[PDB]
Design a protein around this ligand. Structure first.
Ligand code: NI
Length: 341
């Protein structure tokens, strides 16, 4: 049964609620982004409207095979009328096609649903700057002060450096990057750009990327593995036995892999900076974990919420235990008392 934090009051609208069957009263099912926990349930057999971004739409049509009529894509940053309720989609700074949704209720209430987001100061000079927001449905993935991690631009620096070093030292080495969903495309796009290469990948991964409205994408990616010295592989596969396996397949064309596992937070964020990172090493295969996040750090979340001064906050992540819910409330209360709302 659909939880109350997936429903929007005073509408027939639900958000990321595709795994419960038909929801009684729901005229419209919104989808913030193409990540499987959020879309779990959709298929070709959906015959209710879906509102989402253009890019999420492309993924729906081509990867799930939903029928063009039931996909309502909306532009971003444009006031849009939807069953006689004004809504806006805003860029969520998460993965490609990910959005936050502003709902303007008939009664005068204004609700922001952040979907998954990495809060940023550019969101403070968006349309959000123009009016008061009463309710906030918030991505609380990292709502605890231990969760620090570097900027995306810092991490892309490290990466472009590591890879471009090794390749210039040994020009018969492979750069691999791990992946399992959309997100974090900048990791491999940046490395390939520095190496003068296209990124090579499976057919199913190429198919996914071809849905994302990336400019010049035909010049950046390929399904010809042999022609490419940045390869993408499944994240399950990024390990010694599975990389060995892969190093066989290339047929005596490379004598050393240099992988990257972009990850979220791990406990080695608590003691080690990004400039002082190391790989695990079993022979000629070297595996970096690098903490490229597409969610808000604690500080980023705190700043956004303290600027928004929402009258009420409804968490969407880690809501499954009483302990987590309780911890989160205490932080929300601190933030409110500090900031004077
Ligand atoms: Ni996500």
């Amino acid at each position: 049964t659909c939880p109350f934090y997936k429903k929007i009051p005073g509408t027939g609208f639900t958000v990321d609620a595709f795994q419960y069957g038909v929801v009684e009263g729901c005229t419209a099912y919104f989808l913030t982004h193409f990540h499987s926990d959020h879309y779990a349930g959709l298929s070709k057999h959906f015959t209710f409207p879906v509102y989402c971004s253009e890019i999420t739409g492309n993924l729906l049509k081509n990867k799930l095979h939903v029928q063009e009529q039931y996909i309502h894509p909306l532009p971003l940053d444009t006031e849009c009328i939807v069953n006689g309720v004004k809504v806006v989609l805003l860029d969520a700074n998460h993965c490609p096609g990910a959005v936050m949704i502003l709902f303007y209720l008939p009664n005068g209430t204004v609700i922001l649903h952040t979907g998954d987001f990495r809060a940023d100061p550019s969101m403070e000079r968006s349309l959000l700057a123009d009016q008061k927001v009463h309710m906030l449905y918030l991505d609380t993935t990292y709502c605890s002060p231990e969760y620090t991690f570097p900027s995306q631009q810092e991490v892309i620096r490290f990466a472009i450096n590591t890879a471009f070093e090794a390749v210039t030292l040994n020009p018969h080495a492979l750069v691999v990057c791990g992946t399992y969903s959309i997100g974090k495309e900048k990791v491999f796009l940046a490395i390939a750009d520095v190496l003068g290469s296209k990124v090579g990948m499976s057919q199913e991964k190429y198919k996914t990327l071809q849905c994302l409205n990336i400019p010049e994408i035909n010049s950046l990616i390929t399904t010809d593995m042999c022609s490419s010295l940045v390869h993408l592989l499944p994240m399950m596969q990024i390990n010694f036995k599975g990389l060995q396996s892969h190093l066989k397949k290339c047929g005596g064309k490379y004598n050393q892999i240099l992988a990257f596992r972009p990850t979220g937070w791990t406990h080695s964020n608590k003691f080690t900076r990004i400039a002082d990172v190391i790989p695990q090493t079993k022979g000629n295969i070297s595996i970096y974990g690098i903490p490229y996040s597409e969610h808000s750090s604690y500080l980023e979340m705190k700043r956004f919420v303290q600027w928004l001064k929402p009258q009420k906050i409804i968490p969407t992540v880690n809501v499954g235990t009483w302990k987590s819910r309780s911890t989160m409330e205490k932080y929300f209360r601190e933030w409110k008392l500090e900031a004077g709302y």
